[PDB]
Amino acid sequence: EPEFIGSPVAADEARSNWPKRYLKARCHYRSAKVDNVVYCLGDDVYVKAGENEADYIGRITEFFEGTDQCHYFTCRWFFRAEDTVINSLVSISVDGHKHDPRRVFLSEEKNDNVLDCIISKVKIVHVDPNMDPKAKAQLIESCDLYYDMSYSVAYSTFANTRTATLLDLYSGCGGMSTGLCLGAALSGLKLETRWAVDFNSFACQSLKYNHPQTEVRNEKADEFLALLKEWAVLCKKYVEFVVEKLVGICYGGSDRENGIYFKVQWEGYGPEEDTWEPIDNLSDCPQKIREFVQEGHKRKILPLPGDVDVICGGPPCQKDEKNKQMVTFMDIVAYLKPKYVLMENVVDILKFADGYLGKYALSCLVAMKYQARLGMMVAGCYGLPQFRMRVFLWGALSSMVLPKYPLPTYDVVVRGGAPNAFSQCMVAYDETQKPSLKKALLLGDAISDLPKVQNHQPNDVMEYGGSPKTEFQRYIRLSRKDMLDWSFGEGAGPDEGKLLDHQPLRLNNDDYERVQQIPVKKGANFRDLKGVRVGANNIVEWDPEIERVKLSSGKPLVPDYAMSFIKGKSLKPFGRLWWDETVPTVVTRAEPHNQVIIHPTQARVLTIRENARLQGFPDYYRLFGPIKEKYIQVGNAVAVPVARALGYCLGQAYLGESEGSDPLYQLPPS
């Protein structure tokens, strides 16, 4: 029966060993006999947990007699790939990768249970990467269970001049690619983007402009992947008109059936007449391709598995349906197997299907035996005049050091709108008043500098109507080299000191009219337009007095839909915001009726540049395409300062500078 064997008590060295005890322990032993088997501290075991549900797996850290005279054992828990935040969703296979029914993670978590609760003894071994072939396998043969890692419920952490190549996927304009690279630079690491894959021809345009050296790819992620696999195989062997200079390689395409095609050059035919041709038709000229593949390899035009070092996320999640892009992403990661993986995405991941996708990523990363951790981070805390909360998923090899989330650099107050499914994923200060934090910016700080321009400004480049008027403005107008862009290496980047992309949306005349009409007061919105009234619940209704006003065109003041938004209310629609405050999230679509996008004093709505400043975009950074598309480009971008912070932490991880683990990190200047 459950008696305390193991000889006398701890003798009261115990209270030094276990101060908290003196649920308070009135005595302490080194061993216990339950049933007829005997165990001692440090043993591995199975605890009987609740009714018809699993058995806690545990390590014994304590044997003591409660003041009750009841006999307890305190054990530190082992977590099953389920019990972790990734619960269920253990089923995912990725490229023949799966969880291993006997594998666990050591939790610093502890609970005390009466002894009868002990089923029997496990044998739980532990294994490190450095064992390598069989050395693990022999053990895994021996053990009932094994663990290589530790699970911390915070951030769901699964945790045990140099040059780094980066691959960015779904990168428009390269906001995150860039910021990451900058931070990395500060760390002392040189992180250069050697490839970027994006669908939008424009975002590609912009990226290429600002990162001339990176290899931009205008294609779907999938294609790029399949093309990757072939590119590997074909890369191996290196192998009715006369061809020349195959200039291009692509898998899939617009109409193209799946397969490899080459951009071709025919002798004396000129750029026009260059055609994408299927691999087969080129059989007649193998040497051309052999040549092409040859340099291409030396040039590393396409990545091979050992080559990718760090890689960027961002797959849009719009389960099986529009979620596909993350599946594709993780597949990429699988084929390439880089050292580091950084994935950004919206918050809903953890809110939708009860956090289905957050765990899809987490798992896919872990079943791949990557150390993984994650956190939610608000853009504002890092120096932007906006509150934008995004999810960042870290992963790294076991050969490497898991990065960590840089804490808020600014005083922005976080309301913890964190999903439950992950409750403690938020990188925030907790109340420790490290007020050595800067003042949360408002719009004025960002944009007070910019020269005054009208609704129609059709000039990508215009000079500055002023001088940096604030710390921030001082900051964002800085040479590529004053930050460390190194896109151009040693030398000055193009578009020196010029102000670029300062343009608003061109409003169809009448809009120009409603907007012109607005008060330029502080709180101005459509309610100031001459149709105004109130209701028990505030509902804009027409004042039953004035006749409907018509513009200098055949149009009204166009309340027509405005009147009903949130069924009324919604002071948000046509109306100004101002330097006095922040935009919660810069969005992809500039248009007044629902958005409160309107420049405080200018009657033009907000120019893209402004929105970019808001997004932390360094000014030297250019963009391309029509307005409406530029807008999107910046609307999608990760706040560059945030990416910069992550870039730094990552730099340190990669270089190996770091400290005994915990979720978040710090930095001086940065």
């Binding site: 008109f241 006369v242 071709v264 299927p278 080129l282 007649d284 040497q287």
Partner: peptide, 7 residues
């Protein structure tokens, strides 16, 4: 050395 176009 040589190859051929497709529709």
């Amino acid at each position: 050395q040589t190859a051929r176009k497709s529709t």
